[PDB]
Design a protein around this ligand. Structure first.
Ligand SMILES: OC[C@H]1O[C@@H](O[C@H]2[C@H](O[C@@H]3[C@@H](O)[C@H](O)[C@@H](CO)O[C@@H]3O)O[C@H](CO)[C@@H](O)[C@@H]2O)[C@H](O)[C@@H](O)[C@@H]1O
Ligand SMILES: [Mg+2]
Length: 387
């Protein structure tokens, strides 16, 4: 009734819950935090739109901002944040801000940022003649295959078939804009087709698993390094520091290997107010409280998470930590996924087409033709609804 309902996601939700207790002590505003896995959160959000009932404050994945702004689900808080000391846009990285601003209006406040980098076993790489991380597509491919030739049940790299960013990150790296100047999708043109060919090459030559082996990171990346390289974000630095003592000083991160460029994705999450909330004032206090820079830095540093706020990267410990150095370097050129309202549907269509390739053995060009037509059909639909 007067309890403030917050929907949060992943491991970061634990930090939000703990900080919500100081909030309630200082304000008397009781808070109830619902934790939703990232793999269910999209369904849950769609349901809340359709029924017009949901939380008061919602953690929003950056890639879903366009969709839910479009759907009328997030409150225009432009007036409230442009004035605040701790929620004004100019504190945050412009890539993070692009995920909150649509048609001159602001629909949330960046809570944390992330980008994806290469994780690698330094000892295993040296064993196959690499004293440094692979720095090119050709190097990554070469090192992976040398690593998978150690033996049966031993690989060189992983491609996560459920990761929305992967195909698109590599596509940009090979010069594909994903969508051309007109918004026409170009997944069936050569830059993207050769991208998918390249990713599939790891699966076909046995350097990347073609199924879920069911191992946690410590069992796959640690020990003798069944999977000795992979791509992920800050949350995995945290995980590996806590769960893989056996490989202390035998792994590192590095910026992504380059093809035409080594651009990564820019993600993370925003805090937003659900447009149908009857506790808008309370929600905004909670947002403001969660944006105090010291409060933020406390949990971000603890978790090796990347701040979306710029002056936070001036902190002595962030500047000098080797994991933050690599993240910070990668973030310089990281770009959000296409900030379009059908992003998730498109990423799930990619997933299906990827699976047809890597598991079904479909032809890449033929599958990309099919995929691109699917995407064109979706975009044309949206345009008819708009015009
Ligand atoms: O796609 C939604 C949202 O994800 C945000 O990444 C968070 C990450 O979640 C990943 C999933 O997005 C991904 O589908 C699966 C695929 O195997 O793997 C991850 O779980 O979880 C981390 C730990 O909670 C978060 O730090 C991370 O933010 C992404 O940042 C965001 O831009 C995107 O909208
Ligand atoms: Mg092998």
């Amino acid at each position: 009734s007067k309890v403030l309902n917050v929907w949060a996601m992943g491991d970061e939700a634990k930090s939000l819950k703990e900080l919500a207790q100081k909030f309630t002590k200082d304000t008397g505003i009781e808070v109830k935090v619902q934790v939703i896995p990232w793999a269910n959160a999209h369904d849950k959000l769609l349901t809340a739109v359709a029924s017009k009932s949901g939380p008061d404050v919602v953690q929003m994945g950056t890639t879903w901002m366009p969709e839910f702004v479009e759907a009328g689900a997030l409150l225009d808080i432009t007036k409230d944040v442009e004035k605040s000391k701790n929620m004004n846009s100019d504190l945050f990285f412009p890539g993070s801000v692009k995920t909150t601003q649509f048609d001159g209006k602001t629909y949330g406040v960046p809570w944390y940022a992330e980008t994806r980098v290469l994780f690698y076993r330094t000892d295993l790489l040296k064993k196959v003649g690499y004293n440094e991380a692979p720095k090119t597509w050709d190097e990554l491919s070469d090192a992976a295959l040398k690593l998978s030739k150690r033996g049966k049940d031993m690989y060189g790299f992983a491609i996560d078939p459920n990761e929305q960013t992967t195909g698109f990150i590599f596509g940009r790296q090979n010069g594909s804009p994903l969508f051309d100047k007109d918004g026409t999708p170009v997944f069936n043109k050569k830059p993207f087709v050769d991208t998918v060919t390249y990713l599939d090459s790891f699966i076909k030559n046995g350097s990347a698993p073609d199924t879920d082996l069911g191992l946690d990171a410590s069992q796959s990346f640690g020990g003798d390094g069944i999977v000795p390289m992979f791509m992920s974000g800050p949350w995995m630095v945290n995980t590996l520091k806590d769960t893989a003592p056996d490989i202390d000083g035998k792994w590192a991160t590095a910026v992504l290997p380059k093809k035409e460029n080594n651009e990564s994705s820019l993600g993370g999450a925003n805090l937003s107010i659900f447009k149908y909330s009857n506790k808008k004032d309370d929600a905004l206090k909670f947002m403001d409280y969660m944006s105090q820079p010291d409060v933020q830095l406390s949990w971000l540093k603890d978790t090796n998470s990347m701040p979306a706020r710029m002056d936070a990267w001036e902190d002595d410990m962030l500047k000098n930590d080797p994991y933050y150095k690599v993240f910070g370097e990668q973030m310089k050129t990281a770009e959000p996924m296409p900030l379009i309202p059908q992003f998730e549907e498109i990423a799930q269509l990619y997933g299906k087409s990827w699976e047809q390739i890597y598991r079904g053995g479909a032809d890449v060009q033929t599958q990309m033709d099919t995929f691109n037509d699917q995407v064109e059909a979706l975009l044309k639909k949206l345009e008819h609804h708009h015009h």
